[model samples]
Target: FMPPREVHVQVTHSMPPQKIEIFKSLDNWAEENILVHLKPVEKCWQPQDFLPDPASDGFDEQVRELRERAKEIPDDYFVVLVGDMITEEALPTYQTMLNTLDGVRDETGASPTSWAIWTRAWTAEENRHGDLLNKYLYLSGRVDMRQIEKTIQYLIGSGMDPRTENSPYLGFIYTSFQERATFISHGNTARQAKEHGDIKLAQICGTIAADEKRHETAYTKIVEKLFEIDPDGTVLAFADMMRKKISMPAHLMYDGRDDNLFDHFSAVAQRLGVYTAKDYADILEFLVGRWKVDKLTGLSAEGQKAQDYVCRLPPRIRRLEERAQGRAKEAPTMPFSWIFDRQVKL
Candidate 1:
């Protein structure tokens, strides 16, 4: 039998005891950070708001209308939609992964640590994304619901190793990068859905993308603070994560049949402009500017090396992306099980 992960993950850096104290120090802003970045339950949008009301008399009619609008969405859109949904649906894996960081872990299940509160609240807010998309797709009748459900099950069961090495510095860095990627992915999906005449779906994706933006803000700020307190360590962590590549949280996705489902889904997303290599480069560039990487002073010799690597990464990635564009256009289309084996155009 084959192991679930081809490359077993190992901790790349042992977190320093000093860093644990710094993580504790960050608790000072927990209340303010939580207030700004996370919404109260009463104010938060629920999955029901985006779905046909099951208790309403016109529920069936509304569902029929949803399916009609969904019919206009192309096969490639479902691949991206379902892929995104599956990624969100595996929230438990992500929460568990986040808890692995030493100082960030909730001591008790109900620990009052600010980091715990933020993690729990962030997970709660993110919970709506998967539910909303799942209900939307289920009602749309445009995809194979059973297959989609199985993929979600497999994804959660398989788990994911984000290569953060359980270091808070690397964890925040990874989250910052991933948060921006999801925001871009969902934002593009929203526009494409609108273009395809699925206005409701566009709004759904837009809402999720907005949540992702908030998350990106929260994590990026955490890393920025880390940079201030420990510029050398932070810069080194940033460089290390980029070197390993910020693999998506759902890279372990499987449908129990296709071994290459995640790769195929990513290619479809790239082809549809939902997410791209160029987007990756753009994210790196934005973070570099956001953190003011090039402006830092008093860096150690190794820190300067790491800073140079981080500064150079985006332009390097852009160059490679430009060179790969031609090859991308020549790749043949492939069928996805999530869409009932319908082919996605490349």
Candidate 2:
């Protein structure tokens, strides 16, 4: 008699349909609400002619560039996307972010203070982004009214919420980073428009970028305040976020091998200098060195350790600066490659 041997194998993978459903739900709600809010604004404006068709001339080139860069998006990028939607969409986004803040307040049973003040101030600043974008799209005739309305309706029906639970600090850090990232992207979009000789588009994007910058600064200030209140908790939280980056809000939007939305976004950010690892490091250094956040007194031992960790950010920033410069000199890589090959079942 003869004996035979056999081998067994195990497989693990993400369920694309499941992931899409989870992500789409969030986008649907946010988009729908944004559209609803923008309707009135659009009705009051006179529409201009559409810019030269993006399909003509060198438009394909821009889209190609966008596709190439989108490959680098990581799975954890959902957080950033959600933040981006909020920043760009404003009304619903602000409402969502504020809701998170309210949740945190209620959970902690903390009375109103600078946190409430700053959040409100930040929300007001953020509202301008959606306003400017929606107005520009409507007045400039960049997008069709019917299509826009349809998209909004679809998004609302889907209904998305912020992924994190009742922790305003997490939202604060997320927004602080996200706003700068967006400011950079919007600025680049404006520059691209200008380079293409579309003055109106450039101006509109520039206006949005300015709003994003202000929001970033405002959110950063709140994070700084958190450091003053609980340096250890703040530091630990920052480290955790950086170590485990969140997903972008539009994670479930469009899908196709020809598209690379995330890379397009990161490239735009890098090109515009609104956000980069270097920029993030600079922000970290600014909060730590300029604000002297780590010097606050009466901290617990853990808090002191957190402060010490934050203090190391300057040198780390220098390294990032060198890397960014090197990256700039070379051809840019895909920003979200891991997800690129993965098909979106939905």
**All candidates: CA RMSD (Å):** 1.6, 13.8
Query: How much lDDT does candidate 1 score?
Result: 0.86
Per-residue lDDT tens digits of candidate 1, residues 1-346?
Answer: 2214737657644787566877787786756664479988999899888888999998989899998888877888888999999899999988897798877888787778889988888999999999999989888788998998988888888888888888988898898989999999999999988887778888999999999999999999888888888899999999988998888888877887778788888888988889998999999999999999999999999999999999998999999767865547687887777888888875
Error (Å) of candidate 1 at residue 142 is: 1.2
What is the TM-score of each predicted model, taking all chains together?
0.96, 0.52
Clashing pairs in 1: none
The C-alpha lDDT values of all candidates are: 0.86, 0.48
Candidate 2 steric clashes: 30
On residues 37-140, what C-alpha lDDT tens digit does candidate 2 reach at each position? 22233333221222223657965564454333333332233222322432355255444555554322322424243344344444555565555555444433
User: Which 10 successive residues of model 1 have the least lDDT summed?
Assistant: 1-10
TM-score of 2: 0.52
